[PDB]
From a paper:
The 2-HCT family of transporters generally translocate molecules with a 2-hydroxycarboxylate motif (HO-CR1R2-COO−), such as citrate, malate and lactate across the plasma membrane, and activity is tightly coupled to energy provided by a sodium or proton gradient as a form of secondary active transport. Our crystal structures reveal that the KpCitS protomer is formed by homologous N-terminal and C-terminal halves with inverted topology, each containing six transmembrane helices (TM 2–5, 7 and TM 8–11, 13) and one helical hairpin (TM 6a/b (or HP1) and TM 12a/b (or HP2)).
However, it is unlikely that it can escape backwards because it is secured by strong hydrogen and electrostatic interactions. In the outward-facing conformation, L408 and I121 are in close proximity, and serve as a latch governing access of substrate to the cytoplasm.
Residue numbers in the entry:
A (entry chain B): 21 to 247, 263 to 444
B (entry chain A): 21 to 248, 258 to 445
């Protein structure tokens, strides 16, 4: 048998090396050192989670293993500080996370027809709002079951969960909280960041549950649907970065906010890439290159990404500081409110309920971009990255406008 | 026609974006921001270097353009501080340079037969020594033509040039200078780092000259070769496993050169040198199936053919301070340095010819790759003669051959 397309004997060589670097405490805190550890660790736990009987269900087993396992390694101090640093240097300083998402978006968007583009976006945004309504309705419902005043349910539970994640919700929602109340950002942030991560774990769990239910009741699922020389693949990489650059320059210095909403650079990228598709500036050869590149990331490096995601974007200590029976239940139900909210809305709009609940439901309640990858990898619908981003970025910018209003009153 | 396989209209989109990021001064100082700029800049100047007859000869011209051009952009302050930072963050903090070399080495070594491995290394090291001798003989010869005492020619000119580059020569040769003399490291380093970079530019130039001469006089050249069962399939997995092996092998080598076997004897073995022995061992062990062994090759191709232009943009930024060069571009140093390089060329040419290697390739691997700025240099040189597949050999000289210069140094320095 083979591991991660590596035969056992060979994997041993690497697994041995990992441990030599580990116990000798010798590791370069850079790309090389990072991918080295991440590839090996991800490989084993990927396979393990790929074949755990109960633990591996559908396709959403493999990644969730690496993801959760990696977090347990940080919390239990299993990683050394240099190892955490190496991985962190790849995910943040070097910023592999964005690149990864950037590659995906480009590859996913450049593969579809131009005619089909504008058809979706018009019916999608309403679905997102439908999800929020359900997220609020259920939250308040269960909230009063816990004897918790409505305002808090919206300010400390609903809004932050549906928020566009750490940078997009906790970073700015604490800012709006301080601007309107005057109370410390920390007071809010700490509670928000903690609870949103709880829900993020539920989102990833229900993503696999809807997968099972989707393949059990085909009528609800769309089965992954809502509605060449290297040079070609290399050009895909160029377009992935260059498109992200443009979007960045737009959200920072040109068109940071269209109106009362602040448009996150990833949201612009979607409109930039989509525009680039419709412009047909990219030949079908190149448009494939972007697809093929996207595959390489989503199929080879997905395990690696999870090792990084389970390290940086999952502080298990802060979760524990808020894992009172109350928060665990309240948070979960809010997520289910989002599921049913986006399911109903999408069904009415013409989308498949299962995919609608993931893209316009779970992808809202998750920890934004890091979250989307965590969720989408759990339902094996990684090809919906583009949609997931709309909710986390644009749909996140929506939560802010709503937040100011609710916070104000 | 197409700028880096991109039609002119599309390239415009990117080239426009680059300039928007530039003038608005908005750029993420990370991988994404880096590759974005590097890909675009490299693309145009890559094409341009090749297009001009005088500017480019054969396939040699493309990289040297990006390389030199990129340095001129830093010196002339054409790049913004954030842009230099972005590129620097990719090359150093993120350490793309090593990865790149790591991928190459792995792909090059895992492609050859196991029987053929040990045949070369035994005849190579002597050739390196032959190159040094010629590098010293010529240096002293021209040195006395400039009325410069021999000791200095060896301490401030020869040794540092042949040194294993910045980290390997200037960083440690100034250390040996201070241990034996007692005089400041700066005094040495500043002069050494300056002059070695001068020679590094000559090395890259003669690499293309030997290319022309090699294809003009085929008898001297091996056409990419120093020395005179079947893949069934390729999977990304297979290519992906190549990437794993590239990193995991570098890790092991690193753990060996730091905590296990830093120095075999009087020589300190740089981690890259170990990697060569680790990968070579891994080949002979056959732990990797031919499918995987190809994956490493294919991965190597992707870097050496797609990302080579990108690398140069980074190499021309970080590892080429044009201001310190100017601080030592006296007619004297320019000439003395150049001739030392030519001494290395002829030294490694003669030696290799006697050992059984092709003179042209021998002069590049055991000659110019010694006098260059180590690893950054090898890539600069090997891309100039289009013999990128000799990375493995170039590394032996820059790392192991560099560890040799140190032992020699302590003796010469001690002698005073
Ligand atoms: O739903 C239409 C299309 O949208 C794209 O963004 C996704 O990448 C495809 O999987 C999907 O077919
Ligand atoms: O010279 C023998 C072989 O050495 C390897 O390291 C190179 O990658 C090959 O190009 C060459 O054929």
């Amino acid at each position: 048998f083979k591991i991660f397309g590596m035969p056992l004997p060979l994997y041993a060589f690497a697994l041995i090396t990992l441990l030599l670097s580990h116990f000798y405490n010798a590791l370069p805190t850079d790309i090389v050192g990072g991918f080295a550890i991440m590839f090996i660790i991800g490989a084993i736990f990927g396979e393990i989670g790929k074949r755990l009987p109960i633990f591996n269900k559908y396709i959403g087993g493999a990644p969730v293993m690496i993801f959760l396992v990696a977090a347990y390694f940080v919390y239990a101090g299993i990683f050394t500080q240099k190892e955490i640093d190496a991985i962190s240097n790849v995910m943040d300083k070097s910023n592999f996370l964005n690149l990864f998402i950037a590659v995906l978006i480009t590859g996913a968007i450049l593969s579809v027809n131009r005619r089909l583009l504008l058809k979706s976006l018009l019916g999608y945004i309403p679905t997102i709002l439908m999800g929020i309504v359900g997220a609020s309705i259920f939250g308040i419902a269960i909230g009063l079951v816990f004897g918790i005043p409505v305002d808090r349910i919206m300010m400390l539970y609903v809004l932050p969960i549906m928020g566009g994640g750490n940078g997009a919700g906790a970073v700015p929602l604490s800012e709006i909280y301080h601007s309107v109340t005057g109370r410390s950002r920390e007071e809010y942030y700490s509670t928000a960041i903690a609870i949103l991560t709880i829900a993020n774990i539920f989102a990833i769990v229900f993503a696999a549950v809807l997968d099972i239910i989707g393949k059990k009741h085909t009528w609800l699922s769309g089965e992954g649907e809502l509605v060449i020389t290297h040079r070609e693949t290399a050009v895909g990489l160029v377009l992935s970065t260059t498109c992200f650059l443009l979007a960045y320059v737009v959200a920072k210095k040109i068109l940071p906010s269209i109106g009362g909403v602040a448009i996150h650079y990833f949201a612009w990228m979607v409109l930039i890439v989509a525009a680039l598709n419709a412009s047909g500036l990219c030949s079908p050869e190149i448009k494939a290159g972007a697809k093929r590149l996207s595959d390489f990331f989503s199929k080879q490096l997905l395990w690696v990404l999870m090792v990084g995601v389970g390290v940086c974007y999952t502080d298990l200590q802060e979760i524990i500081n808020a894992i009172t029976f109350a928060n665990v239940v309240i948070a979960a139900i809010i997520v289910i409110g989002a599921v049913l909210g986006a399911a109903i809305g999408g069904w009415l709009m013409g989308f498949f309920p299962i995919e609608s609940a993931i893209t316009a439901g779970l992808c809202m309640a998750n920890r934004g971009g890091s979250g989307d990858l965590e969720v989408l990898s759990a339902c094996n619908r990684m090809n919906l990255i583009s949609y997931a981003q709309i909710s986390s970025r644009l749909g996140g910018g929506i939560v802010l406008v709503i937040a100011s209003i609710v916070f104000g009153m």
